[PDB]
Amino acid sequence: SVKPQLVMFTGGRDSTLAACYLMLQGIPVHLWSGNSGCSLHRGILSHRVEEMKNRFGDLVVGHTVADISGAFRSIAIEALEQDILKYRKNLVLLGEKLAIHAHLVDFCRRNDINTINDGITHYQMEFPEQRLVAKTFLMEMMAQYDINYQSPVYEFAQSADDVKYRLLQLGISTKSLEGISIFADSFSTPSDDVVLAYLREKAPLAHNIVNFLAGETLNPP
Amino acid sequence: VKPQLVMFTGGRDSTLAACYLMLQGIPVHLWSGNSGCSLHRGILSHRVEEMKNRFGDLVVGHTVADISGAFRSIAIEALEQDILKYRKNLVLLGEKLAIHAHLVDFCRRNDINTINDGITHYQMEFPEQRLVAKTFLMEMMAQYDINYQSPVYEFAQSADDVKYRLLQLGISTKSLEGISIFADSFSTPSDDVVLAYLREKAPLAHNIVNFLAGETLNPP
Amino acid sequence: SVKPQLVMFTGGRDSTLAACYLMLQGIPVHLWSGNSGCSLHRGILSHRVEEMKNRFGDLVVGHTVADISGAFRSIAIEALEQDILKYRKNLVLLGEKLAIHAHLVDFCRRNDINTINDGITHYQMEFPEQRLVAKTFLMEMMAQYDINYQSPVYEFAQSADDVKYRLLQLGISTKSLEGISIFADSFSTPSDDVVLAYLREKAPLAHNIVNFLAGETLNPPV
Amino acid sequence: SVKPQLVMFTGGRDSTLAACYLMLQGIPVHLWSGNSGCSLHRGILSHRVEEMKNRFGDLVVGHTVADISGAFRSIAIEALEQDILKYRKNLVLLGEKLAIHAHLVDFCRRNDINTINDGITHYQMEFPEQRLVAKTFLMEMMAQYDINYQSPVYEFAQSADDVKYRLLQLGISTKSLEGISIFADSFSTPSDDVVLAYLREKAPLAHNIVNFLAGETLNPP
Amino acid sequence: SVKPQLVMFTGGRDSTLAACYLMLQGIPVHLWSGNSGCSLHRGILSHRVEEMKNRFGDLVVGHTVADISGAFRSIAIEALEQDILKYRKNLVLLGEKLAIHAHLVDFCRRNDINTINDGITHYQMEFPEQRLVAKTFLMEMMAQYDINYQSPVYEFAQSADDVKYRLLQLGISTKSLEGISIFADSFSTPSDDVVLAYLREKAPLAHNIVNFLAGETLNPP
Amino acid sequence: SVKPQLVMFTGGRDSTLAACYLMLQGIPVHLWSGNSGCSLHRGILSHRVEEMKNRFGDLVVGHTVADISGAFRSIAIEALEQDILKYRKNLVLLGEKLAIHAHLVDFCRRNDINTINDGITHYQMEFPEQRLVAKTFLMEMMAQYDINYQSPVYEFAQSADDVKYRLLQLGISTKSLEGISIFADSFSTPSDDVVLAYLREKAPLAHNIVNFLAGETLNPP
Amino acid sequence: SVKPQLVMFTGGRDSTLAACYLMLQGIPVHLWSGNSGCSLHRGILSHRVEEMKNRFGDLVVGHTVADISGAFRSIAIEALEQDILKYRKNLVLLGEKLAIHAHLVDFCRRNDINTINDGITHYQMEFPEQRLVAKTFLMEMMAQYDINYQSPVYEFAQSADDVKYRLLQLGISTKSLEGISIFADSFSTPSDDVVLAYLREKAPLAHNIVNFLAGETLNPPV
Ligand SMILES: Nc1nc2c(ncn2[C@@H]2O[C@H](COP(=O)(O)OP(=O)(O)OP(=O)(O)O)[C@@H](O)[C@H]2O)c(=O)[nH]1
Ligand SMILES: Nc1nc2c(ncn2[C@@H]2O[C@H](COP(=O)(O)OP(=O)(O)OP(=O)(O)O)[C@@H](O)[C@H]2O)c(=O)[nH]1
Ligand SMILES: Nc1nc2c(ncn2[C@@H]2O[C@H](COP(=O)(O)OP(=O)(O)OP(=O)(O)O)[C@@H](O)[C@H]2O)c(=O)[nH]1
Ligand SMILES: Nc1nc2c(ncn2[C@@H]2O[C@H](COP(=O)(O)OP(=O)(O)OP(=O)(O)O)[C@@H](O)[C@H]2O)c(=O)[nH]1
Ligand SMILES: Nc1nc2c(ncn2[C@@H]2O[C@H](COP(=O)(O)OP(=O)(O)OP(=O)(O)O)[C@@H](O)[C@H]2O)c(=O)[nH]1
Ligand SMILES: Nc1nc2c(ncn2[C@@H]2O[C@H](COP(=O)(O)OP(=O)(O)OP(=O)(O)O)[C@@H](O)[C@H]2O)c(=O)[nH]1
Ligand SMILES: Nc1nc2c(ncn2[C@@H]2O[C@H](COP(=O)(O)OP(=O)(O)OP(=O)(O)O)[C@@H](O)[C@H]2O)c(=O)[nH]1
Ligand SMILES: Nc1ncnc2c1ncn2[C@@H]1O[C@H](COP(=O)(O)OP(=O)(O)OP(=O)(O)O)[C@@H](O)[C@H]1O
Ligand SMILES: Nc1ncnc2c1ncn2[C@@H]1O[C@H](COP(=O)(O)OP(=O)(O)OP(=O)(O)O)[C@@H](O)[C@H]1O
Ligand SMILES: Nc1ncnc2c1ncn2[C@@H]1O[C@H](COP(=O)(O)OP(=O)(O)OP(=O)(O)O)[C@@H](O)[C@H]1O
Ligand SMILES: Nc1ncnc2c1ncn2[C@@H]1O[C@H](COP(=O)(O)OP(=O)(O)OP(=O)(O)O)[C@@H](O)[C@H]1O
Ligand SMILES: Nc1ncnc2c1ncn2[C@@H]1O[C@H](COP(=O)(O)OP(=O)(O)OP(=O)(O)O)[C@@H](O)[C@H]1O
Ligand SMILES: Nc1ncnc2c1ncn2[C@@H]1O[C@H](COP(=O)(O)OP(=O)(O)OP(=O)(O)O)[C@@H](O)[C@H]1O
Ligand SMILES: Nc1ncnc2c1ncn2[C@@H]1O[C@H](COP(=O)(O)OP(=O)(O)OP(=O)(O)O)[C@@H](O)[C@H]1O
Ligand SMILES: [Mg+2]
Ligand SMILES: [Mg+2]
Ligand SMILES: [Mg+2]
Ligand SMILES: [Mg+2]
Ligand SMILES: [Mg+2]
Ligand SMILES: [Mg+2]
C-alpha cells in the first residue's frame, strides 16, 4: 500500500482538488484543517468532506480539525500593534500559515507523515502566503524537519476556472465550501520584502512552538 | 465467465442487449451515465427490478455515474461556438463521447474490458448511432484495450424487433428511461460533420481520461 | 399580519440577502427555487435554508422547489439550433428566467401571492437577465397579470462584496450556497437589442404556458 | 365543490394528459382502469399515479382498477371464431372498449358520476375504437344512460409529440406508463363500415351486461 | 436421492394427481405452472400447493410460475386473424401448450431436469392438446432435446370420477383448484388434421423461441 | 332501507350467484352454511367469501357456519338401515336438506329474517332436494313458519355454463369453491314418489327439532 | 410580574453579580452575550448559566448568545491597517464594544427591553474601553434609542474581592467563567482624545448597522 500524505484542507476549491488529485493517483490522504479561532461559518465544510468520501471512499483516511488558536495568537495577534506599525501591512494571515506549519511539524512527527500538501495557486499570488518567496521559505522550514512540503495545484491553477472545472469532472461541487477568516478583506497588498521579513522575524517563535509541542522546552525563544 | 459492462438507460435496446448477454451466461455490470440534463429518471428502478427478477445473480451491479462535468467540458462549454460553426446541435454526440471517456476509467479501475451498448440500425439518423461514430468509438476504446460491442445493432431493423424479444423474456416492452432535455432539439447532421465533431473533441476526451487516471491536471 | 411575498431563491448570496432584507422589515417570505433540470450539486442549498430559518424563524414561511424543466425546454432548448444560429449568442439562461416568470404567474395566482422578488444586481449587468432591458420587460409582463415584480438588492449591489458583508452582519455565511447551471460559462455577451428581441420572440410561448398551467388551453401559441 | 368526473385511465400519455388538464381546471378526477384480463406488465402504472398525486394532490379523488374480464370475454372472445370469419378482422380491442363502456354505465350510476372522459386522439384514428364512427356510436350509447362521454385531448393531439410536451410542462414523464394488451400488433386495419357493424352487433350484449350489473336480469340478450 | 422430475401443474385435478402419484413412488416433483397472461382467478392455486405440501412435504421440491405471455403471443395471438381464417378454428390453447413446451426445453436444460409430466387424460381428448396426434408431436419435439415427456394419468383417467376419487384417497380436495383461460368455451372442435397442421406450422417459431431463450440467436425464423 | 335476506351458501357456483344477484339489487345477504359433520375439504370456502366481500363490501352482512350434525343424524342417519331397506335408495342428502330447513326456521326466528334463498337449479333436478316436488314441499314447510323460501337462479340455470359466465361477469371465479359430502356419488336416482314419501315420513322429526331448538319441548315426535 | 431587563453578560464575576443582584430584587433578566467570532474556550459559560438558573429559576428568562462577527468585522477589523496607523494604538476591543451596542439596540427594540445593565466596576481602569469617556459615549448612543444603560455593581465593587464574596454568599462560584478574546490591549496608554476620536469615527458605521438590522436601509454609512 502507498503511504498516506497530509493535505492542508479548508473545503475550498483548491485544497479539495489537491486532495482529490492525490487520491486519483492511489495516494491516501489525511485531511487537516487548522482552526485559528477567528474563522466564521465553518459548518459547510462537512458537506465537502461527505462529497469527497462519496467520490473516493477509503482513500480519505481521516479529517483532523486542529485548534491552532494559541500558536496563531502568539505569532500574529499578541504583537499586532507593533507588527502593523513596523510593516504598515496587516499580515495576520501570513502569521496564520506559519502557525499551521509549526503545528504540522508536530502532527507529522506524531502521526508518521512526511509529505504535506496545500492548495496554494499561481493565480492567488497577491496573497502573502501564496507568494513564491513564502512558499520557498516554508519549504525550507519543513525540510529542516525532514518534511516534504508540496503544492500540487500551484502551477496548474492559472485561474479559479481551471480548478472549478476539474472538480466538476470529478462529480464534486465547484463552490468554495469553507469558513472565512474574520480578517477577510482587512489588508492591502504587501511587498515580497515585507513578506519575507515578517516570516524571518516570526520564525524563532514558530520553531519554539514546535519545540514546546514536542515536549522539549517550556522556555521562550 | 468474466463480467462485461452494458451502457444501460432502462430503454428497450440496452435492456435487450444486457438480457441477451445474460442468456448466454455472461454476467453484466449495468452502467448508467447521468449527464445532469436528464428528466424523470425514477422509472429506471422498475426496469432494474424486472431484470434482477428474470436473471438473478447474472446482474452483478448497477452503477449510476455522475458524468455531468465531462459532458459539460466536451459538449456544453463551447456550445455557442460549436453550433455556430457546425450549424448543428451535436450535444448528444458529445454526451456519448463523455460516456466513453468515463468508461475507459471505469473499466480500468474495475477489471472490465468488454463494454456493450444498445445502439440500433433503425436509429442511424441519430449521430452517435451512425456507423462512422460507432467505428470511431470502437477505435478509441481499442486504444485502451477495451472491446466495444453493440450486440443488438444489426438485429434491430425496427423497434418492434426489440420489443417482442423483451416480451418473450417476460419483460415490459416500454422504454423505462429518463429523457434528455435535449430531446427533439436538433436537426440531422451529415456524416462529415459527425466525424469532424468527434475528431475535434477527441483530445479533450483523452485528456479527461488522463485526469481521471490521476496522470495530469493540464488541459489538452 | 403582513402578507407573505415570494423570493426567487437559489441559495446564492443576492437572493439570500433579498429574502433576509424583506424579513428584517417584518415581511414573511415564501422561498421559491426553480429546478430547470440542468442544475448540478444543489444539495448545499439546504444548509442555507437552515441558516435562514435559524436567523429569522417563522418569517420563512415555506420553500417550494418547482420542476420547471418542461417550460424551460419549450422556451429555450427545443429550438436551440435555430435560436443560436439566428441570434449568434447562447441565450438559454435568459430563456430560463422567462420560464421562471411564466411558472411564477401560475404559482402566484394559485397561492394568493402578488409580490415576487429576486436577487438580480447592478454589478451583474453583463448577464442578459439582469440588464435593465430584461428587468423592465419582465416587470411589465408580471404587471399584466397583476403581479408586482421587485428586485430589492438591485441598486445597492455595486459589487459582490456589498452583498457578502451585509450577509455577514446578519450572521449568515458569505458563500454562494447554490447549485450551478451546466450552461455556466457556455456563452458570449449579447447586445441589449438581442436580449430584447429574444424576449419578444419567446414571450408568446411563455404566455401560452401560463394559459396551459391555468387550465385554459391545450393549443400551441398563435 | 366542483363535481368529480371520471377518466378512463391507462397510465398512457393521452389519458394522463386528459386527467391532468381536467384537474388544472379545478375538476376532481376519479381515475378508472379496466383490466380485461389479457394485459401484461401493468406494474408501471403505479409510478404514473404517484406522479399525478404529487402534481395535483387531492384533485385525484381515487383510482379504481376494475376487473372487466367477464364482460370482455362475453363481447369479444366467446365468439372469436365467428367474429373473425365474418368481419375478416380481429376486433377484440374494439370489443374491449365496448366492455369498458358497459362497465362504466354501472360504475357511473352507482358512484354519482355523469361525465366520463378518455384519451382517444386524432392521430390514433387508425385504431377502431378511436375512429369518429366509434366515438359517435359510444357517445350515443352513453347518452341513452344520461352520461356525457367526452374526449378532451382528441382534437388537440395531432401527434404524440403534442401530448408529450404538455406532460413535460406539468413536470410529468413523457413515457407511456401502461400495461400492454397481448393483442398488441395482432390485427390489420378495419374499414369504418366493419367497425360500425361490429359495434351494432355487440351492442345488445353490452346493454344486457349493463342490465345484469344493475341487478335487473339474469337472462341473456 | 431419486432425480427430481417436472410436472406441468395447473392446480387442476389431473395434474395434481399426476404429481401426487409420482411423489407416492418416491420421485421428487418440481411443479411448473405456465402463465400465458390471459388466465383469470389463479389465486386458488395456492390452496392446492399447500394441500400437496402438507401431504407430501419435501417431495414437493418447488413451484415455478413462469411468465410465458411473450412466447404465447408470438405463437398464437400475433397472427390470430390469419390463423383463424386458414384453419377456421380458434387454436390458441393448442398454441399455448406449444409455448409451454418451448419454455420447458429451456427450463429443463437450465435446471437439470430431463423428465416432464402432464395431466392430460383420455377422457379429455376432445381438447386439441390432449389428442394422441398432439401428444405424439410434442413427445417427438421434447425427445429432440433429450427430454422425456410422459403423461402418467393419461390411460388411467377414463372419466373425471377416476381422478377425483384417487385424490380423495390422498386426503386432497376433489375440486379443480386452477385459474381459467379467458379462451374457455371460445372454440369449436378441430379435426386431427388441423391440429397437426397447426403444430407443424408453428413449430419453427417454437424452436426459434427455444434458441433465443438459450441465448443462441436474436434473429427470427 | 332494505331488509337483509339469508342465502343458503356452499361456496358453490349457484349459491354464490344467487347471493351476488340479490346484492346487485341492493338486498343485503346473510350467508348461511350448514355443516352436516360429513363434509370434506371445506377450507376453500374462505377464498369464495373473500371474493364476495371484495366485490360487494358491506352488502355481505355475515357468514354463519352452523353445526347441524345432530339434526342431520336424527333425520337421516339414525335409521339408515330401515330407510334404505324401505325406499331402496340412499336419501341422506335429502334428509340433510330437511335438517337445513329445520335449523333455518330457528335461525330466522331468532335473527329477524323472513326470506331465505338457495341456489338449486333446473339443470340439477336429478338430485332429490332440487326436484320440484321437494322444493314445493319445503316452500310449504317454511310458509307454515311465515318464512318465504325462494330459489332465485332456479329457472335461469338451464346449464352450469349459464351460472359460470354470470359469475365471471362479476369478476368472480367460475369454480365450485365448496366442500364435498362424503355421500358424493353414493346413491342412485330416486323417483319423485320416493322423494315425497321420505320427506313426509321425516317431517314430524324435523318439526320436533324446530320445537326443541325454540325451547318448547324435550319430548320426541 | 416586573418588566424584564437585559444584562450584558460574559460569565465573568462582575456581570454574573449584576444579573444576580437584579434577580434578587425580583427583576427578571435576559442574559445577553456578544460573540465577536474571535473568542476562545467559551464552553465554560454554560456552567455559569446553569449555576444562575439553579439559584434563581425563572427569573433567568433566557440566555442569548448573539453572533456579532459581521458588525465587529465592519467596525474594527476591515480597516485595521488604517486604524492602527492613524491612532498608533490597537483599539479593536473598543470597536467590539461599539459593535455590541449596535446589536443591543436591535435586540432591545425587537424584544421590548429598554433597560440594559453591565458589570462595570471601579477597579476596571486599565482597558481603554472601560474608561468613563467610552461609557459616557455609549450611554449617549443608547439614550438616542430610548434605552437606559445602568451599571448596578459599579459603586459597590472597589475590588474583585468585593464581587467574589457576594457571589459566594449566593452559592455561586467566584471564578471568572468566560471565554477570552484572542485580542489583548497593548502596553501603551492612548489619550482620552484618541479613544473618543475612534468612537466618533466609527459611530456612523454603528448607527448604519442598527438601521440595516432594523430593515431600514441597505446603503453604507453616508
Ligand atoms: N491571505 C489570504 N487572504 C485570503 C485568502 N482567501 C481569501 N482571502 C481574503 O478573504 C477575502 C474573501 O475570501 P473569499 O470568501 O474566498 O472570497 P471570494 O473568492 O469572493 O468567495 P468564494 O468564491 O466563495 O471563495 C478575500 O477577498 C481576501 O481578502 C487566502 O488564501 N489568503
Ligand atoms: N441523438 C439521440 N437523440 C435521441 C435518442 N433517443 C431519443 N432522442 C431524441 O429524443 C427524442 C425523444 O426520445 P424518446 O423519449 O425516446 O422518444 P420516442 O421513443 O419516440 O417516444 P417516447 O418514449 O414516448 O418519448 C427523439 O425524438 C430524439 O430527438 C438517441 O438515442 N440519440
Ligand atoms: N446568465 C447568467 N449566467 C450566470 C449567472 N451566474 C453565473 N452565471 C454563469 O455561470 C458561471 C459561473 O457562475 P458561478 O459558479 O456562480 O461563479 P463563481 O464565482 O465561480 O461561483 P459562486 O461562488 O457559486 O458564485 C459564470 O461565469 C457565468 O457564465 C447569472 O446570474 N446569470
Ligand atoms: N386498437 C388499439 N390498438 C392499440 C392501441 N394502442 C396500442 N395498440 C396496439 O398495440 C401495439 C403496441 O402498443 P404500444 O406498446 O403502446 O406501442 P408504441 O407506442 O409503439 O410503444 P412504446 O413506444 O414502446 O410505448 C400497437 O402497435 C397496436 O397494435 C390503441 O389505443 N388501440
Ligand atoms: N383446450 C382446452 N380447453 C380446456 C381445458 N380445460 C378446460 N378448457 C376449456 O375451458 C372451459 C371451462 O373450463 P373449466 O371451468 O375447467 O371446466 P368445468 O368442467 O366446467 O369446470 P370445473 O369442474 O369447475 O373445473 C371448457 O369448457 C373448455 O372450453 C383443457 O385442458 N384444454
Ligand atoms: N343430492 C345432491 N348430490 C349432489 C349435489 N352436488 C353434488 N352431489 C353429489 O356429489 C357428487 C360430487 O359433486 P361435485 O364434487 O360437486 O361434482 P361435479 O360438480 O361433477 O364436479 P367437481 O365440482 O369438479 O367436483 C355428485 O356427483 C353427486 O353424487 C347436490 O346439490 N345434491
Ligand atoms: N493558600 C493558598 N491560597 C490560595 C491559593 N490560590 C488562591 N488562594 C487564595 O484563596 C482566595 C480565593 O482563591 P481564588 O478564587 O483562586 O483567587 P482569585 O484571585 O479569584 O483567582 P482566579 O479566580 O483564578 O482569578 C484568595 O483570597 C486567594 O488569596 C493557593 O494555591 N494557596
Ligand atoms: N485554516 C487552514 N487549514 C488548513 N489549510 C489551510 C488553512 N488556511 C489555508 N490553508 C491552505 O492554504 C491554501 C490556500 O488557501 P486558498 O483560500 O487560496 O485555497 P482554498 O481554500 O483551497 O480554495 P478557495 O479558492 O476556494 O478558497 C489552501 O488550499 C489550504 O491548503
Ligand atoms: N446516459 C447513458 N448511459 C449509458 N448508456 C447510454 C446513455 N445514453 C445512451 N446510452 C447508450 O446508447 C444506446 C442508444 O440509445 P437509445 O435511446 O437508442 O437506446 P435505449 O435507451 O436502450 O432504448 P430506447 O429505444 O427505448 O430509447 C443505449 O442503448 C445505451 O447503450
Ligand atoms: N433556478 C432559479 N430559481 C429561482 N430563482 C432563480 C433561479 N435562477 C436565478 N434566479 C433568480 O435570479 C437571480 C440570479 O442572479 P445571481 O445568480 O447573480 O444571484 P444569486 O444566485 O442570488 O447569487 P450569487 O451571486 O451567489 O450567485 C437570483 O438572485 C434569483 O433571484
Ligand atoms: N383498459 C382501459 N381502461 C381504461 N381506459 C382505457 C383502457 N384501454 C383504453 N382506454 C382508453 O382509451 C384511450 C385511447 O388509448 P391509447 O392507448 O391511444 O391512449 P393512452 O393509453 O392514454 O396513451 P398512449 O398513447 O401512451 O398509449 C386511453 O387514453 C383511455 O382513455
Ligand atoms: N398453464 C399451464 N401450465 C402448466 N401445465 C399446463 C398448463 N395448461 C395445461 N397444462 C397441462 O395440461 C393439462 C391440461 O389438461 P386439464 O386442464 O384437463 O388438466 P388439469 O388442469 O390438471 O385438471 P382439470 O381437469 O381439473 O382442469 C394439465 O394437466 C397440465 O399438465
Ligand atoms: N350444507 C349446505 N348449507 C347451506 N346450503 C346448502 C348446503 N348444501 C346445499 N345447500 C343449498 O342447496 C344448493 C345445492 O345445490 P348445488 O350443490 O348444485 O349448488 P352450489 O353448491 O351452490 O353449486 P355447485 O353446482 O358449484 O355445487 C346450494 O346452492 C345451496 O343453496
Ligand atoms: N462580549 C460581551 N458581551 C456582553 N457584555 C460584555 C462583553 N464583553 C464585556 N461586556 C461587559 O463589559 C464588562 C467587561 O468587564 P469585565 O471583564 O471586568 O467583566 P466581567 O466579565 O463581568 O468580569 P471578569 O472578566 O473579571 O470575570 C462585563 O461585565 C460586561 O457587562
Ligand atoms: Mg479558501
Ligand atoms: Mg433511450
Ligand atoms: Mg447565482
Ligand atoms: Mg395506451
Ligand atoms: Mg384444467
Ligand atoms: Mg354444491
Ligand SMILES: [Mg+2]
Ligand atoms: Mg471579562
